[PDB]
Amino acid sequence: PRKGPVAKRDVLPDPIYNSKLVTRLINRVMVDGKRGIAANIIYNSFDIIKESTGNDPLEVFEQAMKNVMPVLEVKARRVGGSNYQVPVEVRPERRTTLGLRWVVNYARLRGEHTMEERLAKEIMDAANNTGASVKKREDTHKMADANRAFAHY
Amino acid sequence: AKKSMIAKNKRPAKHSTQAYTRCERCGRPHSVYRKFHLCRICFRELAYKGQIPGVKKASW
Amino acid sequence: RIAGVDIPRDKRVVVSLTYIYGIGNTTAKKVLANVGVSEDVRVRDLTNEQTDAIRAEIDKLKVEGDLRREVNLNIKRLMEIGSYRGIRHRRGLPTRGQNTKNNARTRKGPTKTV
Amino acid sequence: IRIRLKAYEHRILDQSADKIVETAKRTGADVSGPIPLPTERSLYTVIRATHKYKDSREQFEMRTHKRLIDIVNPTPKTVDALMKLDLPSGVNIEIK
Amino acid sequence: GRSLKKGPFVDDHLMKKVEAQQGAEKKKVIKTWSRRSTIFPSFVGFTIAVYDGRKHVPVYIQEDMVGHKLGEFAPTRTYRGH
Amino acid sequence: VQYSGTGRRKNAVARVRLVPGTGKITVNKKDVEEYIPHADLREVINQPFGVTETKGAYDVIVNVNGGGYAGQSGAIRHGIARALLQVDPDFRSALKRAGLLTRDARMVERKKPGLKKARKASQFSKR
Amino acid sequence: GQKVHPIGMRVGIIRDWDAKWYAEKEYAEFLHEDLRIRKFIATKLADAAVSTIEIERAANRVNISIHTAKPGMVIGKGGSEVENLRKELNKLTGKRVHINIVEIKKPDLDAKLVGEGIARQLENRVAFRRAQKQAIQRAMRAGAKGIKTQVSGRLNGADIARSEGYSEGTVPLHTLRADIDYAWEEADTTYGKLGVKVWIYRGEI
RNA sequence: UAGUUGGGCACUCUAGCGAGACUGCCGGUGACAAACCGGAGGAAGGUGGGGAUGACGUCAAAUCAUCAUGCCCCUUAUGACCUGGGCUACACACGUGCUACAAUGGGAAGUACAACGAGUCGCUAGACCGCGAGGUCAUGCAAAUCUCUUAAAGCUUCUCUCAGUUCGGAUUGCAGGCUGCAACUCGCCUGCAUGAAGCCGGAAUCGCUAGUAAUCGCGGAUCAGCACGCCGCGGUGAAUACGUUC
Ligand SMILES: [K+]
Ligand SMILES: [K+]
Ligand SMILES: [K+]
Ligand SMILES: [K+]
Ligand SMILES: [K+]
Ligand SMILES: [K+]
Ligand SMILES: [K+]
Ligand SMILES: [K+]
Ligand SMILES: [K+]
Ligand SMILES: [K+]
Ligand SMILES: [K+]
Ligand SMILES: [Mg+2]
Ligand SMILES: [Mg+2]
Ligand SMILES: [Mg+2]
Ligand SMILES: [Mg+2]
Ligand SMILES: [Mg+2]
Ligand SMILES: [Mg+2]
Ligand SMILES: [Mg+2]
Ligand SMILES: [Mg+2]
Ligand SMILES: [Mg+2]
Ligand SMILES: [Mg+2]
Ligand SMILES: [Zn+2]
């Protein structure tokens, strides 16, 4: 807003994994405030992760976040009669936001019948450094690199 | 035709469903409150005057 | 198959029956209740004897060409007597009293920009 | 004996309740209350304008405050005492 | 629809008119403003001039028409097209 | 000996009573798991014990009504915090810094006239 | 922009209902009976300076408190006029009507009376500025903390209607505690209606 | 069997009287000010949230159809009564909404939690008949007592398995229920049958900064009957705000 930066509302940690990141993921997947379905889907996805892999789903998901979270974004700037993009380092809050948004969107776009199945698959691929989410992060960094000449702006 | 309409409304109706309410103050047919027998316009006017017992501007 | 229509094989028996014209989900439930056949078993699994019993029940019911001929006679009857509904049917307009200034696309057909 | 008081203004209502309780207690009868009851509220929304202009409304509310009294061991005097004690016109009163 | 217990509806004046003309060798047009009145097997074979809001349109009644209100057989508004 | 407390959240009101025991919680004569089948909500309810380090020490009997399950859960949490104040005043500091004692005042905002909801406005077309 | 009615804004805050009765099943009937009573009194005592009518109901009885600056004129000689009024009102209403007259001390502080005076003068073709100015002077002498007056219409027969107003002291319509009286009166002239509005801010409550 | 009964008002609740929040206090900045930043305490901290409240004026904005009113026009007619019809039309264009396009779903069964409000020929219990809409008897309540009213999303199981489908529910046929003198023009609702377009939507455009958007129901005004609209209530409940170039 015009006045200045506003306070960020906190999220309590997930009950069963004791993580705030899991709660944020639950919120992202939630639709129409149906947090019950949201939390159930997330837990089923982590169960499928712990099944398809012997690792802790929470650690797997953090690895996927590391792979997907961008570093340089592009901000559009209108310079006179010319409008073009400009690379911009991503603050950590926006990093997590972008990571969750990308992962959830591409999970919804996957082909598997059920959302928890799609979510688990996308998380595993991202942890493996592959999939649509990692591809989107690659494209973001690629756009940033292409416009890297505008870093001084 | 307001006067003739008011007179006809006052008279008993040929069939029950024909009976309808008009604002007994101004004769407006629409928006007549059963509790007060007044249109919305007349209700607001008199309520501002404070001549409708109990009624007052709502706020919550 | 059963009533002259090859019902889907994989689906559950109640749904496969609904695929028959003139039979809805409630009617399928009713005929299965008469025959004693369970609703869950797929039609492919259904034995030939169960299929024969189902055929008897459907043949008791009116379906397919018989049903279609009945309805078309009714509509033809309205049009021929020239009723308001018959005129609605003839000109492809809502018969049930809907307003036609907007919508009515189902009866009217695709929009004509002119 | 039971007494239900109703009024559009809680102020005068409470004044009448005080009078009822005081006269009964003076006459020696025991009184339970006053017991406040859930005040009723009715809401009316009317278009502020006389023609069109649907968005701008105005809301009026009519409130009925109610009090309850229960007289115990009523003396013969109390019955006529509570009928002689006459309330302001703004208070509706019910007995039993 | 109309409650079965209530039975079919017809205006009394129309019913009285058709009754009076029942024993008629040749039916004469019965002019009615009553759209509401339902057609009856007795109505069969009569020509009825039903008001449409501007004039009485004749309709020949038949066993096929019975079971319907008279007003439906007389259209109110005309739409030729555009 | 029982320690009473009253908690409120949205339209929910919870009368809470702490009795020393094994940490079992019963609400409206039914166990917490039955009444509130949401594990996150149950963890919310137990937060005060965690901050006060009184896990398991006290069983809780709660009579709660009004609001929904989440609102009633918040009311239970508020009542539990107040009951703990009765048990020991020194829990006030930890409870306060956790913000458990504050009565969440966020209630439903009234629908405004001319707006489809409290703030949602009808779709607007310039022409 | 428009403004809330000054009285209606404060009814139930510092001002009280004029129709001081309670009813549930007969609410509509009593309300309309009161309206007819008010109209009948307005027609009957038009020349008298009748301002406020407070109606109380006690079973079939109806007590009517009428505030006026001319109690003698309302009463008549030996109560003849009030008695004639009672009989007519009893015929009108169908029940016992008790009438109590109240003397309006300081008529200059009554919104309706001041507005009525200005409307009468306009009907008599007095300069609207003069009427408003003298009204304000009288009100300030009476001791109003402030007064505000406005006249709108085809002033002096002009083809383009407009509004001309004056004020003195303080009239803070937005301060709820302030006891501000208000009244709207119309003057029927040769060119059509002229609207008169008077706000009188007395000692705040 | 039941908050039932007795018993008690303790608790909640109700509703009057009050208390409370005042940058009041503490620290820092500030021109010894205003004030700003932070802290303590507290249920609440800087207007706590929301509402009511809308300055002088602006658009010859809107309303002569709420009402009133200057002037003009009609006066066996532009006045008045009645039946029927129309305002509900339908090659098309636009606005506002509802329902969808499905698996964060559809269906079946079980189980739990609200609030605002309405009620006398009105709310209607309970029972019986009905697949259902409803019907019959019949009970309590002018109501914190009785009823509308066990709310829906929700949670737990089972089923469906990506299909223009067990999605979707338009249109249409038949058969009914009410309300009403009367349901064709032209009501709402029920059952069976049918099963439309629709696979997330171009240019463009809209709302919203938290108990908000989103989503879920519940009540009410008008009202014989009839709402996807309006008013109000509660349930669940997010994302984001770097910043003021545009
Ligand atoms: K009406
Ligand atoms: K139509
Ligand atoms: K349209
Ligand atoms: K109190
Ligand atoms: K007029
Ligand atoms: K005129
Ligand atoms: K348009
Ligand atoms: K709509
Ligand atoms: K399911
Ligand atoms: K109709
Ligand atoms: K209704
Ligand atoms: Mg009507
Ligand atoms: Mg079929
Ligand atoms: Mg229609
Ligand atoms: Mg103009
Ligand atoms: Mg115009
Ligand atoms: Mg005129
Ligand atoms: Mg219209
Ligand atoms: Mg699909
Ligand atoms: Mg804002
Ligand atoms: Mg809501
Ligand atoms: Zn009116």
Coordinates of N, CA and C in Angstrom, one line a residue, chain G residues 70-190:
Chain G
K70 N -50.9 29.6 22.5 CA -52.1 30.4 22.7 C -53.1 29.5 23.5
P71 N -52.8 29.1 24.7 CA -53.7 28.2 25.4 C -55.1 28.8 25.6
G72 N -55.2 30.1 25.9 CA -56.5 30.7 26.0 C -57.3 30.5 24.7
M73 N -56.7 30.8 23.6 CA -57.5 30.6 22.3 C -57.9 29.1 22.1
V74 N -57.0 28.2 22.5 CA -57.4 26.8 22.3 C -58.5 26.4 23.3
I75 N -58.4 26.9 24.5 CA -59.3 26.5 25.6 C -60.7 27.1 25.3
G76 N -60.7 28.4 24.8 CA -62.0 29.1 24.7 C -62.4 29.6 26.1
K77 N -63.6 30.2 26.1 CA -64.1 30.8 27.4 C -64.8 29.7 28.2
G78 N -64.3 29.5 29.4 CA -64.8 28.4 30.2 C -64.6 27.1 29.6
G79 N -63.5 26.9 28.9 CA -63.2 25.6 28.3 C -64.2 25.2 27.2
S80 N -64.9 26.2 26.6 CA -65.9 25.8 25.6 C -65.2 25.2 24.4
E81 N -64.1 25.8 24.0 CA -63.4 25.3 22.7 C -62.8 24.0 22.9
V82 N -62.1 23.7 24.1 CA -61.6 22.4 24.3 C -62.7 21.4 24.4
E83 N -63.8 21.7 25.0 CA -64.9 20.8 25.1 C -65.5 20.4 23.7
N84 N -65.7 21.4 22.9 CA -66.1 21.2 21.5 C -65.1 20.3 20.8
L85 N -63.8 20.5 21.0 CA -62.8 19.7 20.4 C -62.9 18.3 20.9
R86 N -63.2 18.1 22.2 CA -63.3 16.7 22.7 C -64.4 16.0 22.1
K87 N -65.6 16.6 22.0 CA -66.7 15.9 21.4 C -66.4 15.5 19.9
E88 N -65.9 16.4 19.2 CA -65.5 16.1 17.8 C -64.5 15.0 17.7
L89 N -63.5 15.0 18.6 CA -62.5 13.9 18.6 C -63.1 12.6 19.0
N90 N -64.0 12.7 20.0 CA -64.7 11.4 20.4 C -65.5 10.8 19.2
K91 N -66.2 11.7 18.5 CA -66.9 11.2 17.3 C -65.9 10.6 16.3
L92 N -64.8 11.3 16.1 CA -63.8 10.8 15.2 C -63.2 9.5 15.6
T93 N -62.7 9.4 16.8 CA -61.9 8.2 17.2 C -62.8 7.1 17.6
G94 N -64.0 7.3 18.2 CA -64.8 6.3 18.7 C -64.6 5.9 20.2
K95 N -63.8 6.7 20.9 CA -63.5 6.4 22.3 C -63.3 7.6 23.1
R96 N -63.2 7.5 24.4 CA -63.0 8.6 25.3 C -61.7 9.3 25.0
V97 N -61.7 10.6 24.8 CA -60.5 11.4 24.5 C -60.4 12.4 25.6
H98 N -59.4 12.4 26.4 CA -59.0 13.4 27.3 C -57.9 14.3 26.7
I99 N -58.1 15.6 26.8 CA -57.3 16.6 26.2 C -56.6 17.4 27.3
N100 N -55.3 17.5 27.2 CA -54.5 18.3 28.2 C -53.7 19.3 27.3
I101 N -53.9 20.6 27.7 CA -53.2 21.7 27.0 C -51.9 22.1 27.7
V102 N -50.9 22.4 27.0 CA -49.6 22.8 27.5 C -49.2 24.1 26.9
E103 N -48.7 25.0 27.8 CA -48.3 26.3 27.4 C -46.8 26.3 26.9
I104 N -46.6 26.7 25.6 CA -45.3 26.7 25.0 C -44.6 28.0 25.5
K105 N -43.9 28.0 26.6 CA -43.1 29.1 27.0 C -42.0 29.3 26.0
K106 N -41.6 30.5 25.7 CA -40.6 30.8 24.7 C -41.0 30.3 23.4
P107 N -42.0 30.8 22.7 CA -42.4 30.3 21.4 C -41.3 30.5 20.4
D108 N -40.4 31.4 20.6 CA -39.3 31.7 19.7 C -38.3 30.6 19.5
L109 N -38.3 29.6 20.4 CA -37.4 28.5 20.4 C -38.1 27.2 19.8
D110 N -39.3 27.3 19.3 CA -40.0 26.2 18.7 C -39.7 26.2 17.2
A111 N -39.2 25.1 16.6 CA -38.9 25.1 15.2 C -40.2 25.3 14.4
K112 N -41.2 24.5 14.7 CA -42.4 24.6 13.9 C -43.1 26.0 14.0
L113 N -43.1 26.6 15.1 CA -43.7 27.9 15.3 C -43.0 29.0 14.5
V114 N -41.6 28.9 14.6 CA -40.8 29.9 13.9 C -41.0 29.7 12.4
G115 N -41.0 28.4 11.9 CA -41.2 28.1 10.5 C -42.5 28.5 10.0
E116 N -43.6 28.3 10.9 CA -44.9 28.7 10.5 C -45.0 30.2 10.3
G117 N -44.4 31.0 11.2 CA -44.4 32.4 11.1 C -43.8 32.9 9.8
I118 N -42.6 32.3 9.4 CA -42.0 32.7 8.2 C -42.9 32.4 7.0
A119 N -43.5 31.2 7.0 CA -44.4 30.8 5.9 C -45.6 31.8 5.8
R120 N -46.1 32.1 6.9 CA -47.3 33.1 6.9 C -46.8 34.4 6.3
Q121 N -45.7 34.9 6.7 CA -45.2 36.2 6.2 C -44.9 36.1 4.7
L122 N -44.3 35.0 4.2 CA -44.1 34.9 2.8 C -45.4 34.8 2.0
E123 N -46.4 34.1 2.5 CA -47.7 34.2 1.9 C -48.2 35.6 1.8
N124 N -48.0 36.4 2.8 CA -48.4 37.8 2.8 C -47.4 38.7 2.0
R125 N -46.4 38.1 1.3 CA -45.5 38.7 0.4 C -44.5 39.7 1.1
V126 N -44.1 39.3 2.3 CA -43.0 40.0 3.0 C -41.7 39.5 2.4
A127 N -40.7 40.4 2.4 CA -39.4 40.1 1.9 C -38.8 38.9 2.7
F128 N -38.4 37.8 2.0 CA -37.9 36.6 2.7 C -36.7 36.9 3.6
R129 N -35.8 37.8 3.1 CA -34.7 38.2 4.0 C -35.2 38.8 5.3
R130 N -36.2 39.7 5.2 CA -36.7 40.3 6.4 C -37.3 39.3 7.3
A131 N -38.1 38.4 6.8 CA -38.8 37.4 7.6 C -37.7 36.6 8.4
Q132 N -36.7 36.1 7.6 CA -35.7 35.2 8.3 C -34.9 36.0 9.3
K133 N -34.5 37.2 8.9 CA -33.7 38.0 9.8 C -34.4 38.3 11.2
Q134 N -35.7 38.7 11.2 CA -36.4 38.9 12.4 C -36.6 37.6 13.2
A135 N -36.8 36.5 12.5 CA -37.0 35.3 13.2 C -35.7 34.9 13.9
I136 N -34.5 35.1 13.3 CA -33.3 34.8 14.0 C -33.1 35.7 15.2
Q137 N -33.4 37.0 15.0 CA -33.3 38.0 16.1 C -34.1 37.5 17.3
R138 N -35.4 37.2 17.1 CA -36.2 36.7 18.1 C -35.7 35.5 18.8
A139 N -35.2 34.5 18.0 CA -34.7 33.3 18.6 C -33.5 33.5 19.5
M140 N -32.5 34.4 19.0 CA -31.4 34.7 19.8 C -31.7 35.4 21.1
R141 N -32.7 36.3 21.0 CA -33.2 37.0 22.2 C -33.7 35.9 23.2
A142 N -34.5 35.0 22.7 CA -35.0 33.9 23.6 C -33.9 33.1 24.3
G143 N -32.8 33.0 23.6 CA -31.6 32.4 24.2 C -31.1 31.1 23.5
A144 N -31.6 30.9 22.3 CA -31.1 29.7 21.5 C -29.6 29.9 21.4
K145 N -28.8 28.8 21.7 CA -27.4 28.8 21.4 C -27.1 29.0 19.9
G146 N -28.0 28.6 19.1 CA -27.9 28.9 17.7 C -29.2 28.7 16.9
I147 N -29.3 29.3 15.8 CA -30.5 29.1 14.9 C -30.0 29.1 13.5
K148 N -30.8 28.4 12.6 CA -30.5 28.3 11.2 C -31.8 28.2 10.5
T149 N -31.9 29.0 9.4 CA -33.2 29.1 8.7 C -32.9 29.1 7.2
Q150 N -33.8 28.6 6.4 CA -33.6 28.4 5.0 C -34.9 28.5 4.3
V151 N -35.0 29.2 3.1 CA -36.2 29.3 2.3 C -35.8 29.0 0.9
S152 N -36.6 28.1 0.3 CA -36.3 27.6 -1.1 C -37.6 27.7 -1.9
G153 N -37.4 28.0 -3.2 CA -38.5 28.0 -4.1 C -38.4 29.2 -5.1
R154 N -39.5 29.5 -5.7 CA -39.5 30.7 -6.7 C -39.6 32.0 -5.9
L155 N -38.5 32.3 -5.2 CA -38.5 33.5 -4.4 C -38.8 34.7 -5.2
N156 N -39.8 35.5 -4.7 CA -40.2 36.7 -5.3 C -40.7 36.4 -6.8
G157 N -41.3 35.3 -7.0 CA -41.8 35.0 -8.3 C -40.8 34.8 -9.4
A158 N -39.5 34.6 -9.0 CA -38.5 34.3 -10.0 C -38.7 33.0 -10.7
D159 N -38.4 33.0 -12.0 CA -38.6 31.8 -12.8 C -37.6 30.7 -12.4
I160 N -36.4 31.0 -11.9 CA -35.5 30.0 -11.5 C -35.5 30.0 -10.0
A161 N -36.0 28.9 -9.4 CA -36.0 28.7 -8.0 C -34.6 28.6 -7.4
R162 N -34.4 29.1 -6.2 CA -33.2 29.0 -5.5 C -33.5 28.9 -4.0
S163 N -32.4 28.8 -3.2 CA -32.5 28.7 -1.7 C -31.6 29.8 -1.1
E164 N -32.2 30.4 -0.1 CA -31.6 31.5 0.6 C -31.7 31.2 2.1
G165 N -30.6 31.2 2.8 CA -30.6 30.8 4.2 C -29.8 31.8 5.1
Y166 N -30.0 31.7 6.4 CA -29.2 32.5 7.4 C -29.0 31.6 8.6
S167 N -28.1 32.0 9.4 CA -27.8 31.3 10.6 C -27.1 32.2 11.6
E168 N -27.1 31.8 12.9 CA -26.5 32.6 13.9 C -26.1 31.6 15.1
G169 N -25.0 31.8 15.7 CA -24.6 31.0 16.8 C -24.0 29.7 16.4
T170 N -24.5 28.6 16.9 CA -23.9 27.3 16.6 C -25.1 26.3 16.3
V171 N -25.0 25.6 15.2 CA -26.0 24.5 14.9 C -25.3 23.3 14.5
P172 N -24.6 22.6 15.4 CA -23.8 21.4 15.0 C -24.6 20.2 14.9
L173 N -25.2 20.0 13.7 CA -26.1 18.9 13.5 C -25.5 17.6 13.7
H174 N -24.1 17.5 13.6 CA -23.5 16.2 13.8 C -23.2 15.8 15.2
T175 N -23.3 16.8 16.1 CA -23.2 16.5 17.6 C -24.5 15.9 18.1
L176 N -24.5 14.7 18.4 CA -25.7 14.0 18.7 C -26.3 14.5 20.0
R177 N -25.5 14.8 21.0 CA -26.0 15.3 22.3 C -26.8 16.6 22.2
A178 N -26.4 17.4 21.2 CA -27.0 18.7 21.0 C -28.5 18.6 20.9
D179 N -29.3 19.4 21.6 CA -30.7 19.5 21.5 C -31.0 20.4 20.3
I180 N -31.2 19.9 19.1 CA -31.5 20.7 18.0 C -32.9 20.3 17.5
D181 N -33.8 21.3 17.5 CA -35.1 21.2 17.0 C -35.2 21.6 15.6
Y182 N -36.1 21.0 14.8 CA -36.2 21.2 13.4 C -37.7 21.1 13.0
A183 N -38.0 21.7 11.9 CA -39.3 21.6 11.3 C -39.3 22.2 9.9
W184 N -40.2 21.5 9.1 CA -40.3 22.0 7.7 C -41.7 22.4 7.4
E185 N -41.9 23.6 6.9 CA -43.2 24.2 6.6 C -43.2 24.8 5.2
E186 N -44.3 24.7 4.6 CA -44.5 25.2 3.2 C -45.4 26.4 3.2
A187 N -45.1 27.4 2.4 CA -45.9 28.6 2.1 C -46.4 28.5 0.7
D188 N -47.8 28.5 0.6 CA -48.4 28.4 -0.7 C -48.5 29.8 -1.2
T189 N -47.8 30.1 -2.3 CA -47.8 31.4 -2.9 C -48.4 31.3 -4.3
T190 N -48.4 32.5 -5.0 CA -49.0 32.5 -6.3 C -48.2 31.7 -7.3

